[PDB]
Each structure stands twice: as structure tokens, then as C-alpha cells.
Amino acid sequence: FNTNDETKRIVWTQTAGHCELCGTDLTFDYRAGKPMKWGEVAHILPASPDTANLMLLCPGCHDKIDRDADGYPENDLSGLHQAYLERIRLAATTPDGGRAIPLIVQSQHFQTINDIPVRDLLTAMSAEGLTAFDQGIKIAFAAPGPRGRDTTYWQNVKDSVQYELEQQLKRRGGTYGDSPALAVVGLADIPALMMLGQSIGDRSKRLIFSFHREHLLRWPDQSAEPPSFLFTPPPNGDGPLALVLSISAQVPVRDVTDALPGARIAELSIPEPSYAMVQNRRVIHAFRDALQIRLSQLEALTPDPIHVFAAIPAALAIEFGALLTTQHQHTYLIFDRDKENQDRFTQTLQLGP
Amino acid sequence: NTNDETKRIVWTQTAGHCELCGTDLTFDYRAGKPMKWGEVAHILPASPKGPRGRADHDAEAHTNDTANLMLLCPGCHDKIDRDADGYPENDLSGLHQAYLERIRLAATTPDGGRAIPLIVQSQHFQTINDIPVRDLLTAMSAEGLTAFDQGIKIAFAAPGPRGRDTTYWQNVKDSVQYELEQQLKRRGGTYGDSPALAVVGLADIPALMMLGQSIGDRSKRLIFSFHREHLLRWPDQSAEPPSFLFTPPPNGDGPLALVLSISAQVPVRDVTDALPGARIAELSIPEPSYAMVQNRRVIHAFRDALQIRLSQLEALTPDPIHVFAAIPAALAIEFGALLTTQHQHTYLIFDRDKENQDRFTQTLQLGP
Amino acid sequence: RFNTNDETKRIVWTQTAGHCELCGTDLTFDYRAGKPMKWGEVAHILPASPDTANLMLLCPGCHDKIDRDADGYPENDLSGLHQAYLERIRLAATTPDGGRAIPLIVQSQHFQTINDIPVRDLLTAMSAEGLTAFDQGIKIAFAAPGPRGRDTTYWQNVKDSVQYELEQQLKRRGGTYGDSPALAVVGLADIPALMMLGQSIGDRSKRLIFSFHREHLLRWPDQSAEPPSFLFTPPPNGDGPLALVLSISAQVPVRDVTDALPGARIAELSIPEPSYAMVQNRRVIHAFRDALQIRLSQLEALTPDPIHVFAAIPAALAIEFGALLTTQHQHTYLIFDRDKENQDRFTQTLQLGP
Amino acid sequence: FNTNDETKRIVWTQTAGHCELCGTDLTFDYRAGKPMKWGEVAHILPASPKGPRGRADHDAEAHTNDTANLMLLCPGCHDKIDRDADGYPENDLSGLHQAYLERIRLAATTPDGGRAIPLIVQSQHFQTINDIPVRDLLTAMSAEGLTAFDQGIKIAFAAPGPRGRDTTYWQNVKDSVQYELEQQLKRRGGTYGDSPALAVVGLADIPALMMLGQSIGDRSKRLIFSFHREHLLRWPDQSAEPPSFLFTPPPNGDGPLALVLSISAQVPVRDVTDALPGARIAELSIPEPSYAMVQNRRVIHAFRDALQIRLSQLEALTPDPIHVFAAIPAALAIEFGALLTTQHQHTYLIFDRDKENQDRFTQTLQLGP
Ligand SMILES: Nc1ncnc2c1ncn2[C@@H]1O[C@@H]2COP(=O)(O)O[C@@H]3[C@H](O)[C@@H](COP(=O)(O)O[C@H]2[C@H]1O)O[C@H]3n1cnc2c(N)ncnc21
Ligand SMILES: Nc1ncnc2c1ncn2[C@@H]1O[C@@H]2COP(=O)(O)O[C@@H]3[C@H](O)[C@@H](COP(=O)(O)O[C@H]2[C@H]1O)O[C@H]3n1cnc2c(N)ncnc21
Ligand SMILES: Nc1ncnc2c1ncn2[C@@H]1O[C@@H]2COP(=O)(O)O[C@@H]3[C@H](O)[C@@H](COP(=O)(O)O[C@H]2[C@H]1O)O[C@H]3n1cnc2c(N)ncnc21
Ligand SMILES: Nc1ncnc2c1ncn2[C@@H]1O[C@@H]2COP(=O)(O)O[C@@H]3[C@H](O)[C@@H](COP(=O)(O)O[C@H]2[C@H]1O)O[C@H]3n1cnc2c(N)ncnc21
Ligand SMILES: [Mg+2]
Ligand SMILES: [Mg+2]
Ligand SMILES: [Mg+2]
Ligand SMILES: [Mg+2]
Ligand SMILES: [Zn+2]
Ligand SMILES: [Zn+2]
Numbered sequence A: 001f002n003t004n005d006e007t008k009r010i011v012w013t014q015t016a017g018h019c020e021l022c023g024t025d026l027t028f029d030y031r032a033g034k035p036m037k038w039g040e041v042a043h044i045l046p047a048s049p050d051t052a053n054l055m056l057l058c059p060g061c062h063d064k065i066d067r068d069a070d071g072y073p074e075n076d077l078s079g080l081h082q083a084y085l086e087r088i089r090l091a092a093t094t095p096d097g098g099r100a101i102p103l104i105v106q107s108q109h110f111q112t113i114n115d116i117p118v119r120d121l122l123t124a125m126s127a128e129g130l131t132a133f134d135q136g137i138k139i140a141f142a143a144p145g146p147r148g149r150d151t152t153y154w155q156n157v158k159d160s161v162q163y164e165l166e167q168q169l170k171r172r173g174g175t176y177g178d179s180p181a182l183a184v185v186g187l188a189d190i191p192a193l194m195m196l197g198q199s200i201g202d203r204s205k206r207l208i209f210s211f212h213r214e215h216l217l218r219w220p221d222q223s224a225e226p227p228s229f230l231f232t233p234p235p236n237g238d239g240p241l242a243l244v245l246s247i248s249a250q251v252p253v254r255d256v257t258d259a260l261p262g263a264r265i266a267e268l269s270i271p272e273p274s275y276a277m278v279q280n281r282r283v284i285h286a287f288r289d290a291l292q293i294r295l296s297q298l299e300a301l302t303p304d305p306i307h308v309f310a311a312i313p314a315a316l317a318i319e320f321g322a323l324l325t326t327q328h329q330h331t332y333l334i335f336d337r338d339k340e341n342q343d344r345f346t347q348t349l350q351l352g353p
Numbered sequence B: 001n002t003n004d005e006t007k008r009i010v011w012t013q014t015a016g017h018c019e020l021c022g023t024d025l026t027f028d029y030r031a032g033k034p035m036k037w038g039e040v041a042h043i044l045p046a047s048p049k050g051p052r053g054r055a056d057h058d059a060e061a062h063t064n065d066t067a068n069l070m071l072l073c074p075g076c077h078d079k080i081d082r083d084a085d086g087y088p089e090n091d092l093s094g095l096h097q098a099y100l101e102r103i104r105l106a107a108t109t110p111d112g113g114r115a116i117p118l119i120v121q122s123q124h125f126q127t128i129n130d131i132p133v134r135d136l137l138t139a140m141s142a143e144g145l146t147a148f149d150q151g152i153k154i155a156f157a158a159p160g161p162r163g164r165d166t167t168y169w170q171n172v173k174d175s176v177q178y179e180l181e182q183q184l185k186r187r188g189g190t191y192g193d194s195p196a197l198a199v200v201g202l203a204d205i206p207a208l209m210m211l212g213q214s215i216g217d218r219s220k221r222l223i224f225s226f227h228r229e230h231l232l233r234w235p236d237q238s239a240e241p242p243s244f245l246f247t248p249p250p251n252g253d254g255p256l257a258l259v260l261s262i263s264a265q266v267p268v269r270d271v272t273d274a275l276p277g278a279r280i281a282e283l284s285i286p287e288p289s290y291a292m293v294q295n296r297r298v299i300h301a302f303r304d305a306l307q308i309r310l311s312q313l314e315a316l317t318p319d320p321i322h323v324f325a326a327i328p329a330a331l332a333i334e335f336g337a338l339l340t341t342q343h344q345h346t347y348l349i350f351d352r353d354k355e356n357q358d359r360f361t362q363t364l365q366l367g368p
Numbered sequence C: 001r002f003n004t005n006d007e008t009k010r011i012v013w014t015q016t017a018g019h020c021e022l023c024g025t026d027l028t029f030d031y032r033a034g035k036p037m038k039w040g041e042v043a044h045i046l047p048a049s050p051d052t053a054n055l056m057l058l059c060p061g062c063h064d065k066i067d068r069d070a071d072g073y074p075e076n077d078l079s080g081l082h083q084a085y086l087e088r089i090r091l092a093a094t095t096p097d098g099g100r101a102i103p104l105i106v107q108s109q110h111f112q113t114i115n116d117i118p119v120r121d122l123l124t125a126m127s128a129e130g131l132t133a134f135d136q137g138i139k140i141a142f143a144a145p146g147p148r149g150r151d152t153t154y155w156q157n158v159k160d161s162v163q164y165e166l167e168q169q170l171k172r173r174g175g176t177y178g179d180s181p182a183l184a185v186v187g188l189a190d191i192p193a194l195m196m197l198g199q200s201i202g203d204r205s206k207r208l209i210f211s212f213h214r215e216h217l218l219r220w221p222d223q224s225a226e227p228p229s230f231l232f233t234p235p236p237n238g239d240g241p242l243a244l245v246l247s248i249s250a251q252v253p254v255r256d257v258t259d260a261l262p263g264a265r266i267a268e269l270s271i272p273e274p275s276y277a278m279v280q281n282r283r284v285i286h287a288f289r290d291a292l293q294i295r296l297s298q299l300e301a302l303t304p305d306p307i308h309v310f311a312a313i314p315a316a317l318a319i320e321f322g323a324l325l326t327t328q329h330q331h332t333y334l335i336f337d338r339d340k341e342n343q344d345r346f347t348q349t350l351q352l353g354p
Numbered sequence D: 001f002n003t004n005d006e007t008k009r010i011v012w013t014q015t016a017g018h019c020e021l022c023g024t025d026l027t028f029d030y031r032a033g034k035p036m037k038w039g040e041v042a043h044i045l046p047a048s049p050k051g052p053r054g055r056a057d058h059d060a061e062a063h064t065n066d067t068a069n070l071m072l073l074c075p076g077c078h079d080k081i082d083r084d085a086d087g088y089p090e091n092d093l094s095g096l097h098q099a100y101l102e103r104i105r106l107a108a109t110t111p112d113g114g115r116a117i118p119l120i121v122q123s124q125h126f127q128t129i130n131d132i133p134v135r136d137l138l139t140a141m142s143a144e145g146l147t148a149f150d151q152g153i154k155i156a157f158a159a160p161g162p163r164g165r166d167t168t169y170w171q172n173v174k175d176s177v178q179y180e181l182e183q184q185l186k187r188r189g190g191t192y193g194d195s196p197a198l199a200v201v202g203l204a205d206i207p208a209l210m211m212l213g214q215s216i217g218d219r220s221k222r223l224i225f226s227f228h229r230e231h232l233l234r235w236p237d238q239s240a241e242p243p244s245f246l247f248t249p250p251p252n253g254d255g256p257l258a259l260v261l262s263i264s265a266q267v268p269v270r271d272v273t274d275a276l277p278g279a280r281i282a283e284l285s286i287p288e289p290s291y292a293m294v295q296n297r298r299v300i301h302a303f304r305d306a307l308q309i310r311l312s313q314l315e316a317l318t319p320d321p322i323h324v325f326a327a328i329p330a331a332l333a334i335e336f337g338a339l340l341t342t343q344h345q346h347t348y349l350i351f352d353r354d355k356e357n358q359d360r361f362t363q364t365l366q367l368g369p
């Protein structure tokens, strides 16, 4: 059946220029430098024996359809037609699935030495299709009190973070009323970054970003493969179980045994420990995958706490904390270098029952 | 000056939506008139004085080069041209190419019928837990599945001040056995008399097992999976499923326990601590991992491994089977779906009790 | 005096809408008087504390009273009133996004055939009121009754079908605060079916009824019009079945009521001049509900027995009638409608309540 | 026939730099983070009689700098109104234009009445959607000079399960009010301070609104708001005088004491004695019970004053609990509850309509000291 040139344009657009029965790109001639004969390379016909009910078919598939004198089909195709348009519509609207909340969490120290502006995260976000729609959240961990970073302090940190987060996640939108994605970067001490991960978890639409010394908030290399994560099991024994992460750098054994005498060391590392190893986000996912496989191995060995000494990039420390948010909880005692005690590893954070 | 033919192509290959915000540029939904209110924007400008303009660029080349032309809404167009540094050529080119490819994939995906989208999530975690609706619909579409609406999304009430107490599990049961059945009954007709069910869950393990039991009679059940790295996308369609190793239970008269060590190794100490004298049968994989649900074949291999073992274990004793599971959420659903009718023993589901220092304690009873 | 970048002047002037943050005076008076603006003379930018989001816009009078330092920075801290001032402007400027809405047209098979309502007609009327759809409008028709007629199962399926569609109202949240969108609904069907539409949507959400008007289509005939008095005659004391007659679009002949409900004790709500055209604006619908609910409370106090409804009311009022009867409290209402295959005699077609 | 730069700068100032038709912020690009003026000054009536909304009798020369003829629009809204002149007629646009400008002025001229925590509490026990928009509460607050550091707390009760409003249901209600709400107010603690004000609107089970008010009644500077079928969160009529609150006292005797509240509607006394045999009935009513009677906050305060007096009177008349049978608007249920925090410590048993028992009154929550 015949159509005007205006209807042709509408049907061609709503189908993205593919045959609805076979999927062939009917703009091929244009791609091969030739002139586009819209009327020749495609036929339009009703889906059932309004531009919404008109299909775009290639000549081949069209000739296979039984039609009556007026060009209408004999068999109903509205099912496959509406389903086709729905698939195109879902792909065409995909950018509105990038609504996102910018979150920059820094210690008061790095907020001074190395402040991360919102513009820098928004540019990295924008490049990945994540679209902020309001002011980015920028917050700094509470300056500790007289009792130090004890339980009440860390519980307040978590309440604070989860409060600001939950208020922004109310900003539902897009095609389906989904909460926005969380785009989070962290630049603080390793225990605080772990509590940031305790706060956000890993069971929502959330994308970690990484502050890189060279490339800043842009990913150094999207193509890089993640390094292999090498595991050294602990020696048999009775001493305290110590998990050593040598990722940014090699942790000296002496520093661990000094802080934790008798420690039996289990170690996760990479071939060349380096500060620049977070080449892309897959590296962070690969780290968590390897870590969790080994944490399960270690937890099957002992019901006793695991003492963590970590030289890890900031992004990895967040994912670590986020990993340990299942219902199941094993006790993890996190150690960090006390800059006021000759950089001695001292216990700073407890996670678990 | 882009010619008329190329502008049409741009409108065609983008399906008439803005490539940066996804809004529909073929229609004004406020007042209801079909209208083309989008703009064919140049990434590299015609003249070198424009935004992203550079000296080494033959402008006569890319004036009709669709790789350099984006369909944008007027607002997104104005924004990129007023902040060239914020929207560099390379970022716009990637976004431009990623957008066009998503439309190609959808146009070339063969039709696979209709299905009701069903998301089931809990609030028993100490963090947000929220499965995006778009990501389920997108996973469905990648397999040719569509729906007449965005589907059903059930969020369990959160634990009250007493943790996961009797009230809580009563709310869970009502959510799965009443609320869900109501939501599906309201779709009856629109989808027909026996519609396919595209289900994904991230909730308490015993709740997901109950969910699988209640939907296990339904044919055309397509389980999807939330994955920490890939969200609802299958991590690797070509991945080979892991082998499932079964340790049969020792002989005796103690209580029979089925331990599933898939996401992690369940410490045997925790099982006997909760069920002294337990005769432990175990299903496990060589490298227990949260990441293991690489594709639906993995899920199907899990149920095939376990269909048989449930029959063997049930043919040993008449008493209840105590379940201790560290398993991914999709396999918790699949496990419950085996209890629907294939296996009508009584199964007592233990779970980690945060009120008891992570000890295993009994929760739901799944009987016939 | 704080030195202004000339461009920071336009940022601050814009974010405050050109009023003094202390006295509320509109500082664009000279432009209103046909003269050129002196943006640096009619107002003094001043940081709120002793980025451009921390700069207030005072007038000269208020600026002096704010004892400044040499360069301008104030003495007392006005950071709270400033941020509260900006919050109030942002609330008002973003108010158009409070109009996000779902269009819903609901018709019977018959009226969809003789008097179809296209989405375009509802959308234009919504737009005039600041209600803006963001997706295709819902347009549905009540299913045709099966062999059992319109029995309880039929009507529950009507309700399920409507409330399934309304899941868009619940879920497609958006805007500045994540609110569910408004529902904009118009119905044109038999009165029993329209009452079930009202039963489905309720009256406890942001929801705006529209009315199809013979002359004015979906546009309101007269926004100024005063709602009519809803006149009420109580029923005669007695034991007969209590009948509520609504003579709004037309006078309902009492003989048709008693013919169908022998011994009917008639209570009547009407207007002085029953008219098809009486729905002149939305306030008329609200006024009808208010008067209706006052009288239903009176009638339910008179008797525990069911109330038999014989309504001659515009379609929009029938929706609101059904929406009113969605509290936890339920009294039994038996809705009667004229059956064409029985000489247009009133016949019981719907039961609401326990 | 071009608009000059001064007029455009006024248009930008008038509107606070937002699109008058969709409310998007036109002074900033939140995606990439750069301040930028990405808005347009759109003419309602065009200079040429052939343009969109063009009229032959329009003096184009005398309106190109008429700000009543100019709207600040985002680029998309401007494109749409010029391609569908029939869908966006001048009357419609002028009306929306003036409405937009007025709300700006009101905000700019409203005095600072301080800060308050927005609190919305709604149930799901109705057979319809039940949803109080956050924007409407925030706009009610702003109209009285109240702002908030964020959009506040919104609590939605779990819906009833297959057995109706049973023991599990009322336990969930108790957890929502006494635990979930309390946890969120604490967590908010810090942004607001020690003793912040609560701007509260409720639309939930009568017994749950009463529990709510009792729970929050300690807190000073509570600002009650009301959801209204016609006016939503707007007050129907600030000038309306409160109605008379008629009270009839109970008869003497040893039977259980019942307080019937006929405000929203007349509570039939036959239903009270059906549920509570031998009831001695006291009734507080208004001359014309109506769902719409909450015309302004003074109506709410007059109900509170009247009821305070009668609770004192009734509490000196029975040793057993006072049984409440209430057909009252949601805001008055909250204020009733707030009288039970400390001023009235007798035990109150709240009855409510039971849709599983054919609309009979049934006992629900017990409220006490
Ligand atoms: N033997 C050993 N040798 C070297 N380091 C060792 C160690 N034993 C322990 N460590 C500690 O392991 C962490 C590795 O350093 P990193 O940079 O890879 O990751 C850090 C970390 O995640 C967090 C807190 O920093 P810090 O407290 O210095 O902890 C350091 C370091 O002291 O912030 C990250 N971070 C700091 N500054 C950054 C910057 N400029 N850019 C990007 N990320 C930056
Ligand atoms: N000794 C032991 N060691 C480790 N775990 C042990 C254990 N003994 C029991 N367990 C339990 O095994 C489950 C493993 O986690 P999982 O992710 O593989 O599977 C979960 C599960 O299917 C369901 C409920 O979660 P939870 O109650 O935390 O159960 C946990 C844990 O408590 O949701 C899944 N789920 C959680 N978070 C998810 C996320 N972010 N993305 C995708 N799915 C996610
Ligand atoms: N002379 C008379 N004496 C006594 N009772 C008379 C009567 N004449 C009509 N009645 C009865 O009074 C009900 C109200 O009539 P109405 O038109 O004011 O409202 C109707 C109603 O709400 C619903 C179903 O229509 P119907 O079944 O005819 O109901 C009539 C009829 O039972 O649709 C509305 N509706 C119909 N057509 C419409 C249109 N074209 N435009 C807008 N709304 C239209
Ligand atoms: N004989 C009798 N006759 C009439 N009612 C009777 C009765 N015996 C008891 N009652 C009860 O008196 C309350 C009157 O209704 P109301 O609106 O005046 O007050 C309600 C109430 O405060 C709370 C819970 O509602 P509900 O449980 O339905 O209680 C109803 C009703 O069952 O929410 C308010 N509320 C409901 N819907 C609302 C809306 N749409 N807009 C604004 N507020 C709304
Ligand atoms: Mg351009
Ligand atoms: Mg334009
Ligand atoms: Mg432009
Ligand atoms: Mg214009
Ligand atoms: Zn084909
Ligand atoms: Zn756009």
C-alpha cells in the first residue's frame, strides 16, 4: 500500500532503518556511497489486516507476506511489530539511564594536600555516559574526637554518609523511576575508605572512580587487562592470622610482625606492585573477585579474626569495604600506619560481629 | 552544511532520540503533536573557529560524515557547544559510537516473545539494595524478550528493631505469597493465561528459595542475575559452567544436612555448631566465588547437578533436610524451584543470624 | 563595597531574582520606569559570611545597616537567611516540574465509537494548567461483559485493569524531589463503570479530573463560575428501601425509581437547574463531592441498610462519587442504571461496599 | 524588532534563570559542571503575523521589549511552542507566564520564618494509591517562611497482608513509628540541631496517626499540616472561623466509657454499642460533619482546645480505659495523639472500621503512659 513522503520519514525513524522481520540495515546503500532510494529499498505496510501501526520491511521479507488487494497483510504482525519498536525505544532511551549522583569523599588531609573538584569527576562521569542533574556531594570525614576513631566515631561516619546518600537516591527519574547511579571517588586513609565502602555496599547501580596521579580522575587505560593476583597461603600454626595486601607496594614483613607478633602471613599481591595499577574499573572488579575467593579460603581455615595490613590504591580500599556487607560477617581487624608512632601499623578499625 | 540526505540518515540511525540524554525528538508529549525538534550537531565544527575546532581537519570531508554528526536535543546541543573543554571530541565520539551500537543491537535482535519482568529485593542488608528496572528490561531485550509494562518490583519490608524476627518472616511470606500473586493477577489478560516470567532476585536466601518454590510450577521461567561487576548483563555467555562436586553424607542416624558451598566455602564447624551430629552432604564448586553466575547455563548446571542429589538424599531418610547455603541469589531461586513438586520432603532453611554472632539458625520451613 | 566582576553581578542578580534578600524590595524598578539599570548602584553584592553562591544581594539601605569591613565582608553572619532565601527561590523556579503527570482516558466501547476522545484533547487541556505529560497517554476501554454480564468478577477485573495501568502514576517518579507524577483523568462511559474508575483512582494523591463537555470539549467552560447550590430533600421516614436520587444533569422521574424499587423512600440531591453543561470548572466537581459526602453521612446515620443510587449526573461527577467511597469505612451502595434492552428501566448494576 | 540586551537581562532576573515551562535550571550545566546561560528569551506573540501565534492586529513594534510577552525558556521548550502554536495558544502561555512570575515574587518577599524538618507519614491500607507529594509540603512550609536543609522524612507503612490489618500489621505500624521514624530523626540530627521543629502531614490509619502524634508530642514547635481532597496541602480558607465543637456527656454508670468523635462524619451510635456492649457514650461533634472541614490551622487548634477540656472531664469518670470511636480528619488524629504524650495519661483503646468484619468497629491499638 502507498504512503506519502512524510509518513515514510516517521516509519524510517521509529524503526532506526532496519527491517523489522530480519534486522537488515536498510541504510546500507548510503554507507556504500550510493544514493538513498527510500521507496525502493524498503516497503511500508500496516502490521494488521496511524504511523504507530506501520512496519518497515525490506523487499525480501515484504514479498513473503500475504497481502490483500489494498496492500494490507492477511496475517496479524502487530505482536512482532510492537515488540520491535519496544526494543528500539529501550535502546534509544538508554542515555537517561545514566542519571547519577557525584560523590567525592576525602579526609581533611587530602582535602588540603590534594583537593578533588567536582568538575574533575563530572568530566570523567560525562565521558562514561553518567549525567549529574544537581550539585555534586563533596564531604570530608569528621575530624576525630578525644576518644579517637572508636566505634561511635565510625558509626557516625556511616550514618552521615548513608544519610546524604539515601536523600539523593530519592531523586528517582528517567524512563522507569529508577534511583540514580552513585558515582563515587575516595581519597582518604585506608580505614576511612573501607568505611565508605561499608556505607555504599555493592548491590546497587554504583560506579567507583579513581584519582590517578598522572591522569587524575580519567582512567589511564581502558584497554589494559587486570593483573594476575598472586596468593601466598599462610603457614600452618597458631599465631594470629594476618592478611597482607601488597598491591600499591610490597608490605615489609617486619612491619607486620612488629605490630602483630607471631603473625602467620597470607599475602595477596600483583606481579609488579605499583601506585598506578588502577588502569581501569575492571582492575577494581578483578581485585574484589580474587580477594573474596581467598577470604573464603582463609575463613574456612579459622574462626578467628583476620588482621589486615594493606598497601592498596584508594579505589581498591573502598571495594574491599563494600565486599564485606553481606549478611554473613567475619571479624576483620584493619591496621594502618600511625604517622604519630613512626609509621607503625596499629589497629584502627573493626568490621564484623 | 550537511545535506538533506545525511540529516535523514542521522535521524534514522539514532531512532530519533537525543544521543546524550535519550529524550524523544519525534514527538511533543506535553501537547501531543508529532514534531521533529532535534538538531543534527557537528562534533568537529564546519569552521575551525567553532567549539572543538582544530587546524588539521578537512572540513569539506566531515560535513556529510555521519561519524561526526549527532542527533541532539536543542539543550544538549547548546551545552556541548558552550563547553568544548567539558565535552571533548574523543568523549563525544565514543558516546556517539556507543549509542549507535546499542540501537544496532536492538534492531538486529531476533524476537523471543513476551515475559513479565519481576524484581524481588529485600532490605535486610546494612546498605542500599536496589535492582534498577532498566537493567532487567535491557537484559531481557538482549535475549529478544519484551514486556507490556516495566513489570513487578517487590521490596520486602525492612527488619524492625528486633532484627529478622517472627514478624519479619511473616512479612516476607506475605510479600512472596500474597503481594506478588496480586501483582500477577492484575496482569492477567494483558499477558494472557500462562505468561513467561523474567525474574531476578536479591533478597534473603530463604526468601528467594520460597520465591522459587511458589513460581516453580510456572513454565517459561527465565532467571536473570544481579552481578556485582556486570549488574544484570550476563558476564560471559561463552563461559563454561563449573563442575559441581557432591560429597555424599556419612552413614548414621544424626540429622541430615545439605551444605551448598557455591559463593563461598561453608565452614563445617558452623554447620555442626548449629546442628550437632549433622550428617553433612555437600555440593560445591572447585573455586567458590561470588562472581560465578557467568551465564544462565551455570544456573541450569546447578539445578541439573542438584535435581538428582535431592532424590538421593530424600531416599535416605524420611526426616527433614537441613539446608546451609552460601549461594548466589539466582541459585537460591533455582533451588526453591526444585522443591515445587519434584521433591516434596520438608526442608529447614538455616541462615546467618546477625543477632547470634553470625551463627546459623533456622528460618523458614519449605514443605509440600 | 564588595567589588563585582560585572559577570558575578549577573549571576547574583539572577539567583536572587533581583530582590533585596533582607527587605524583599524588587530592585528592577528603574527598568519598569523605562530607564536604564544601574545594577551596581541600586544594589550592593555582599558575602553572607564574615564562590558566588555565598554572595547576597542587598539594597543600599540594607547594605549600610549591615556593618561591613573595609572591602565589604560583613560583621554578623547572615549565612542562614541567605541560604533560606535561595532555597525559597529555587522551590518557586522549579515549580513547573511539579506538573509531571500521566494522561488517562477511560471510555466505554460505545462512547469510544460515537464520541472518541483523542489524547491530544486531554494533553492540550493539561498543558494549559501546567500539567505536562512526558510519555504516551493511557487510553483504555472497559472490557465488554461476558455471558455472566457485569457481575462482581467483571467489576473486580475492571478495577484490576485500571489499577494496573495506574502503576505508572505510582512508579515513574521524577522532578526535583522524586515525587510520583500527577494523574490527569477523563472518563466517558456509563455511570456504574465511571464509579468503578473513581473507586480505582481514589482521592488521596495528586490527581486532577477533567470533563468532556459537549460544547467546550476538554476545556473548562468557565473558570470563574460559582458552583450551584446542591439542594437536598430528606427521605420520608419509613421502612422502605432508601433511595438516593441525584438530579444533576436532569430531573430523574420519580416513577421510574419506584417502578424499579417498590416502596422506595426517596432522598434527593439536585441543583436548581439540572443541566448537561453544569460542570463549568473543577471546583464544581469538588463542591458536588463536599455536598454529597455531607448528605451520605446524614443518610447512613438514618439507617444501616443499603442506599440505592439512581443518578443523573455528568460523567466527571460519577468518577468523583466513586472516588469518595474509598475510605476504610464502607457502607453498602447499590447503583442502578437504565437498561436499554428493557425499555430504559433502572436496574441494579453495581454493588459497592461490604 | 529584536529584543535588546537590557530586556533579556531583566527576563533572566525575573525568572531566577529557570525555564518557565519545565523548571529546569538554565544558569548551570550539571553534567559537565560549567556555569552557562543555556536559556532563550522566547516571544509569546511574534513580530510577524505569520509566525506562531501571529495576529494581524498585533503591534509588533510595541511588544518586542514587553516582558509580559517574553518568557525564559530552555531551548527545547521554545522549539516545541513555536512548532505547535495551536497546542500552545497565547492565553495559555500568558497565564502560565504570569503564574510563574508571581511565585518568584512571593518567594522573594516571604520573610524568613526559620527551619523545620519535613515529615510525611502515609499508610497503604486503602485500596487506592495514597501518596502525599514532597513538593506540596515543602511549598506549604515555604509559604509560612519555613525552609529545610533537605526534603525531609517520608515514611510509608507496609500494606496489609492477606489477613487484613492483623497483629502483624499493627506491629509493623508500631515499628514504623517508634523505630523507623526515630532512627531517621536521629540520623538527621546534626544538620538541624537539638530541638528542631517538625512540619508534619499525615494520611494513614487513624490509630497510627494517634500513635504518631503521641510519639512526637514531646517535641516543641510542631507545625501541623493537612492533606485536603480539594486543596492538597494548601489551606482551603485562612479566614474561615472554626466551627462549634458540640459535646454531649456520658450517662452515669459502670459500663465502659466511649468517646465518639463525629467530625468527618456522623458516627452511628448503633455501631459503637454493637462493638462495645453497655457503652456509656460521650460525643464530640460539629454541626455539619464533613471531610472538608479542615479549612486552616486554627480549625485544628480549636479542635485541640475543645478536646483537651473533654478528655479532662471524661478521665475523671471511669476506672477502665476510654474507648475511642473516631471519624476525624488525619490532621486531627495527630493532634489528638499529641494530647496523650503527657497531658492525658489514661489508657485509650482505639477502635477502627474493620473491612474484614463488614465495617464493624474493632479494637486496634492501645495507647497509654
Ligand atoms: N610499604 C608501603 N609502601 C607504600 N605505601 C604503603 C606501605 N605500607 C602501607 N602503605 C600505604 O598504602 C597506601 C598506598 O598508597 P596509594 O597512593 O596507592 O593508595 C593510598 C591509599 O589507598 C589511601 C591512603 O593513603 P596512605 O595513608 O598514604 O596509604 C598508602 C600508603 O601509606 O589513599 C591513597 N592515596 C594517597 N595519596 C594518593 C594520591 N596522591 N593519589 C592517589 N591515591 C592516593
Ligand atoms: N560462610 C559464608 N561465607 C559467605 N557467605 C555466606 C556464608 N554463609 C552464608 N553466606 C551467605 O551467602 C551469600 C553470599 O553472597 P552472594 O552475593 O553470593 O549471594 C547472596 C545471597 O544469594 C542473597 C542474600 O545475601 P546474604 O544474605 O548476604 O547471603 C550471602 C551470605 O550471607 O543475595 C545475594 N547477594 C548479596 N549481595 C549481593 C550482591 N551485592 N550482588 C549480587 N548478589 C548478592
Ligand atoms: N432527560 C433525561 N432525564 C433523566 N435522566 C436523563 C436524561 N438524559 C440523560 N439522563 C441520564 O442521566 C445521565 C447523565 O447524563 P449526562 O450526559 O449529563 O452524563 C452522562 C453520564 O455521566 C454518562 C453515561 O451517559 P448516560 O448513560 O446517558 O447517563 C445519563 C442518563 O442515564 O456519560 C455522560 N455523557 C453521555 N453523553 C455525554 C456527552 N455527549 N458529553 C459528555 N458527557 C456525556
Ligand atoms: N461512619 C463513618 N463514616 C465515615 N468515615 C468513618 C466512619 N467511621 C469511621 N470513619 C473513618 O473516618 C475517616 C474519615 O475520612 P477522612 O478523610 O475525614 O479522615 C481520614 C482519616 O483521618 C485517615 C484514615 O482514613 P480512613 O481509615 O479511611 O478513616 C476514615 C473513615 O474510615 O486518613 C484520612 N483520609 C482518608 N482519605 C483521605 C483523603 N483522600 N484526603 C485527606 N484525608 C484522608
Ligand atoms: Mg553545534
Ligand atoms: Mg533549536
Ligand atoms: Mg541552539
Ligand atoms: Mg520563539
Ligand atoms: Zn527483512
Ligand atoms: Zn539531549
Ligand SMILES: [Zn+2]
Binding pocket: C020, C021, C022, C023, C024, C025, C058, C059, C060, C061, C062, C063
Ligand atoms: Zn533591603
Ligand SMILES: [Zn+2]
Binding pocket: D019, D020, D021, D022, D023, D024, D073, D074, D075, D076, D077, D078
Ligand atoms: Zn523547558
